[PDB]
Amino acid sequence: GSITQPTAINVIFPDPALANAIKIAAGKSNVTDTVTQADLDGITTLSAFGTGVTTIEGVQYLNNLIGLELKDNQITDLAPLKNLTKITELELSGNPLKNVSAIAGLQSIKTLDLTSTQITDVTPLAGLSNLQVLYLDLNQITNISPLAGLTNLQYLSIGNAQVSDLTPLANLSKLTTLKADDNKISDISPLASLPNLIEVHLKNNQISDVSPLANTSNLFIVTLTNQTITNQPVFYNNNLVVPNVVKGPSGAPIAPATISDNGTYASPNLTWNLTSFINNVSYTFNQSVTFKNTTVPFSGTVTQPLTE
Amino acid sequence: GSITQPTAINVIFPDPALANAIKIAAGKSNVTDTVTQADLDGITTLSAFGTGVTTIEGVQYLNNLIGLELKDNQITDLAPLKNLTKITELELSGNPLKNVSAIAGLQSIKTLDLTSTQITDVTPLAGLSNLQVLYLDLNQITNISPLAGLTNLQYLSIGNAQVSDLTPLANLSKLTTLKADDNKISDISPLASLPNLIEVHLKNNQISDVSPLANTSNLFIVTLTNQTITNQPVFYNNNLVVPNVVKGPSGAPIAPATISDNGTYASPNLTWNLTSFINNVSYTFNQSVTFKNTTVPFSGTVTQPLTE
């Protein structure tokens, strides 16, 4: 519906912090001042970072709202957004949302920040086909399949989540910045089909082979340190020979920097001469590698579990 | 012209490092092996970072070349590129180019890295209307006027140059990433017209007023520490009253953190009670400021020269 007659700001917006934000946005001097629907239709952005907002009740009257920035509040219910149709930027970082089902029909959205919103499922984003910038950092998200159809995506941040499978990114051809530090990524093969990638952050994952990025011609920033690789188990025995899964941009194996248990290397295999059973063996690597444009450090630890 | 008959790679490419790069790109086993024009027309990328290339003679036969990546070489002459028409990515970082007049007609180029190329003038880029990604870091460039017509620009890096005037960026509406640390930027007013800016790096400039970024709704990363501000001179006298030029995102003055010479502050003015002539007075500031989406540190030093 609409605001029929002039009504006090803080009657339409029950949240006292939000009401003061509306008061300022409307150019009024007191939250008790009346506003009309005209007034409300003149509000295109509403911002209230760190102001203790608990409810967005009222925002359903901001027909012309383009940007809503409510970072680090206590918002739990996004129903008031359901019928908004001009919103292109939505910043809800640091709110205890738990789910974002309510934003599924908001197709106008181009930029969306859901960092630290206690969400696990991004199914509701599958239909946000106009998305260009997306933050999902600091959420226990394990599956990004619903992003696969986001073909306008240009900037994707998913740091500090639980992502492994990057196959959903394969057709996101406009991607230029991918931030995915501290996840569970082991295979980056899907990145090969992203020819515009400029910046890729993959520190602290489980990546052994960086050759999928060797042909990315727009690639200028790439972080690859501190990978933690765990191999599938092999049998313990005296003459232990294990292929080295760590590959550089050319696809050739990377020589280990250190090897546990007095082991040796002869590309492509590590060899250990063991006489007693141990849970595992391991090695480290740290080498400058060279991609299409530049060179950076690639490092990590490989653990090889052993079976008796 | 064209290669008429099969000719040895290292007869077409006199540079021995480049010849070996062509040998690999062509799938041959020796730089003396012949190639045909067909062979050459099948080469779409050529890369030779850190290989001591001194000449790109021969590349004029790579009609279908899309990407040329020659970072950290000793190349001085870019004439061989003049008639290439499919090149979209050109990486010439760390070559003693001195000028880039030769690339002016290369309108196909979308991504160009000229970091550390000893250049001073970017007039030759004015016609590269398809440019989306540009690096000019680590060049004594003082004027970026020739960039003004680069309306497809999305990613601009100009760190460690001598840039002051950002007016040329005003109409670059597609800009999303601007990297401009360590320049001579004092006024960032032109940034107000860039509504898509996501990342802006402005550490170590001379910026006093950050209010031009207050309405940038897509802005998520902004660096603003260590500004070095020098005011225009004022007269020395006993009762010295000086308006505070340092403004936060709202446009209101930022209270100083420290003030020289036992001075005091009453917004908007610093006051010093001096009895002897000194070259100048100064103050520091360091405050968390809040933009549309997030909050970051804004800090620096202001020096006020005094006249007798």
Write out B101-154 in H/E/C secondary structure.
Answer: HHHCCCCCCCEEECCCCCCCCCHHHCCCCCCCEEECCCCCCCCCHHHCCCCCCC
β-bridge pairing B67-69 and A67-69 = unpaired
Q: Are B303 and B231 in contact (CB under 8 A)?
A: yes
Strands B89-91 and A133-135: unpaired
Q: In what order do the strands lie in the sheet with B264-266?
A: B239-243, B269-273, B264-266
Strand spans (E) along chain A? 7-8, 34-35, 45-47, 67-69, 89-91, 111-113, 133-135, 155-157, 177-179, 199-201, 221-230, 234-235, 239-243, 258-259, 264-266, 269-273, 280-290, 295-307
**Coil, strand or helix: which one is A249?**
coil
Distance of alpha carbon A52 from alpha carbon A75, whole angstroms = 9
- The two tokens of residue A170 are 């394969």
What's the alpha-carbon Rg for chain A, to the nearest Å?
Answer: 25
Distance CA B38, CA B56 (A): 20
Min distance A39 CA to chain B CA atoms (Å): 20
Count other Cβ atoms within 10 Å, centred on residue B96: 12
Q: In terms of CATH architecture, what is B44-205?
A: Alpha-Beta Horseshoe (3.80)
Residues of chain B neighbouring A113 (CB-CB closer than 8 A): 220, 293
* CA of B129 vs chain A CAs: smallest distance (Å): 18
Burial of B75 (0-12, 13-18, 19+ CB in 10 A): buried
| The two three-digit tokens of residue B211, written as one number | 């209010």
Elucidated via: X-ray
- A47 to B292: CB separation less than 8 angstroms, yes or no: yes
**In Å, how far is B72's CA from the nearest CA of chain A?**
9
What are residue B107's phi and psi, to 5 degrees?
-70, -20
Q: Using DSSP, how many helices (H) and how many strands (E) does chain A show? A: 3, 18
Sign of CA dihedral A221, B88, B181, B287: negative
Cis, bond preceding B268 (omega within 30 deg of 0): yes
3-state SS class at B279: coil
User: Does CATH number 1.10.8.390 belong to domain A1-43?
Assistant: yes
With beta carbons less than 8 A apart as the criterion, state whether B246 and B300 touch.
yes
Token readout for B97 is 């180019």
Domain B206-308: give its CATH code. 2.60.40.1220
Q: How far is CA A3 from the centre of its chain?
A: 39
Q: What residues contact residue A88 under an 8 Å CB cut-off, 6+ apart?
A: A66, A67, A108, A109, A110, A111, A130, B217
User: Are the C-beta atoms of A62 and A84 separated by less than 8 Å?
Assistant: yes
Measured from the Cβ of residue B160, the count of other Cβ atoms closer than 10 Å reads 20
| Domain residue limits, chain B | 1-43, 44-205, 206-308
Q: Residue type at B64?
A: N
**Residue listed under structure tokens 């030759």:** B124
Resolution of the determined structure in angstroms stands at 1.8
Q: Contacts of residue A198 in chain B, CB cutoff 8 Å?
A: 133, 155
Residue with tokens 């207050």: B214
Residue B274 to residue A28: CA distance in whole angstroms: 44
DSSP letter (8 states) at residue B224: E
Nearest to B41 by CA among B12, B20, B69, B71: B12
Q: Which one, of B91, B51, B84, B85, lies nearest residue B68 by Cα?
A: B91
Chain A partners within 8 Å of B113 (Cβ) = 220, 293
Q: Which residues are CB-contacts of A235 (< 8 A; sequence separation ≥ 6)?
A: A306, A307
Using an 8 Å Cβ cutoff, are B93 and B157 in contact? no
| Residue bearing tokens 């003459």 | A239
- Is residue B250 within 8 Å of B214, Cβ to Cβ? yes
**Beta bridge partners of residue B243, listed in sequence order:** B269
The phi and psi torsions of B193 (rounded to 5 degrees) equal -90, 10
Q: In this complex, do A292 and B113 lie within 8 Å of one another by their Cβ atoms? A: no
CA B143, CA B130: separation in Å to the nearest integer?
A: 20
The CA distances from residue A167 to A119, A130, B183, in Å, are 21, 20, 41
CA distance B173 to A267: 51
- The amino acid occupying position B259 is I
Residue A112, class by beta-carbon neighbours within 10 Å (0-12 exposed, 13-18 middle, 19+ buried)?
Answer: buried
Q: How far does A48 lie from chain B, in Å, by closest CA? A: 9
Burial of B83 (0-12, 13-18, 19+ CB in 10 A): exposed
How many other C-beta atoms lie within 10 A of the C-beta of residue A4? 8
Q: Closest Cα of chain B to A111: distance in Å? A: 7
Say if B30 is an interface residue toward chain A (CB within 8 Å): no
* C-alpha separations of A197 from A132, A264, B15, B130, B269 in Å: 14, 37, 31, 17, 48
Q: What count of other Cβ atoms lies within 10 Å of the Cβ of residue A185?
A: 20
What type of residue is A13?
Answer: F
B227 contacts B205 by C-beta, under 8 angstroms? yes
Residues in contact with B178: Cβ distance below 8 Å, sequence separation at least 6, in sequence order: B156, B157, B169, B191, B194, B197, B199, B200, B201
Tokens linked to A155: 């900037």
Q: State the Cα angle at B203 between B198 and B205, rounded to 5°.
A: 120
Q: What is the DSSP letter of A292?
A: S
- Residue A25 in 3-state DSSP? helix
Pair A151, A130: CB distance under 8 Å: no
> Shortest Cα distance from B280 to chain A (angstroms)?
39
The b-or-e profile of B243-275 (16+ CB within 10 A means b, else e) is ebbbbbbeeebbebeebbeebeeeeeebebebe
Q: Are A156 and A137 in contact (CB under 8 A)?
A: no
Longest dimension (CA), chain A: 88
Same fold across A1-43 and A44-205: no
Spell out the residues 6+ positions from residue A299 whose beta carbon is closer than 8 angstroms to its own: A224, A225, A226, A227, A284, A285, A286, A287
The tokens for A180 are 């995915």
Best CA proximity match to A112, nearest among A95, A88, A94 = A88
Amino acid at position A48, single letter: A
Three-point CA angle A121, A124, A127, nearest 5°: 140
Q: Which residues of A touch B69 (CB under 8 A)?
A: 217, 292-293
What are the backbone dihedrals phi and psi of residue A35, each rounded to the nearest 5 degrees, phi first?
-130, 155
The sign of the dihedral angle between the CA atoms of B243, B246, B248, B254 is negative
Could you give the C-alpha distances from B51 to A67, A220, B48, B98, in angstroms and in order? Answer: 50, 19, 6, 20
Which stretches does DSSP call E strand in B5-127?
7-8, 34-35, 45-47, 67-69, 89-91, 111-113
Given a contact cutoff of 8 angstroms between Cβ atoms, the answer to whether A69 and A47 are in contact is: yes
Cβ(B291)–Cβ(B214) below 8 Å? yes
- Is some CB atom of chain B closer than 8 A to the CB atom of A198? yes
Six token digits for residue B75: 């190349």
Pair A53, A73: CB distance under 8 Å: yes
Minimum Cα–Cα distance from B70: chain A residue:
A293
What residue has token string 């050459």?
Answer: B40
Asked if the Cβ–Cβ distance from B218 to A113 is below 8 Å, we say no
Using CB atoms, pick whichever of A45, A176, A294 lies closest to residue B217: A45
- The rounded distance, in Å, linking the Cα atoms of B301 and B29 is 61
Distance CA B273, CA B254 (A): 21
**How many contacts does A have with B, using Cβ atoms within 8 A?**
73
Residues A53 and A18: their CA atoms lie apart, in Å, by 6
Cα separation, B16 vs B131, whole angstroms: 31
Judge if the upstream peptide bond of residue B6 is cis by omega within 30 degrees of 0. no
Rounded CA gap, A155 and B221, in Å? 13
Closest partner residue to B67 (CB to CB) among A133, A135, A217 is A217
User: B12 CB contacts (<8 Å, ≥6 apart)?
Assistant: B3, B22, B35, B40, B58, B61
Q: How far apart are CA B131 and CA B140, in angstroms?
A: 21
3-state SS, B180-219, equals: CCCCCCCCCHHHHHCCCCCEEECCCCCCCECHHHCCCCCC
Residue B218 CB contacts under 8 Å (≥ 6 apart), including other chains: A89, A111, A133, B176, B195, B196, B197, B198
d(CA B79, CA B98): 13
Q: Which of A271, A263, A267, A265 is nearest to A242 (CA)?
A: A271
User: What's the maximum distance between 2 C-alpha atoms anywhere in chain B?
Assistant: 88
Q: Is the peptide bond before A268 cis (omega within 30 degrees of 0)?
A: yes
Distance separating alpha carbons of residues B12 and B25, to the nearest angstrom: 14
- Report the chain A residue with the minimal C-alpha distance to residue B91: A293
The answer to whether B139 and B118 are in contact (CB under 8 A) is yes
- Mutation for testing the B interface, residue in A174, A218, A288 having most B CBs under 10 Å: A218
**What's the gap between Cα B306 and its chain centre?**
34
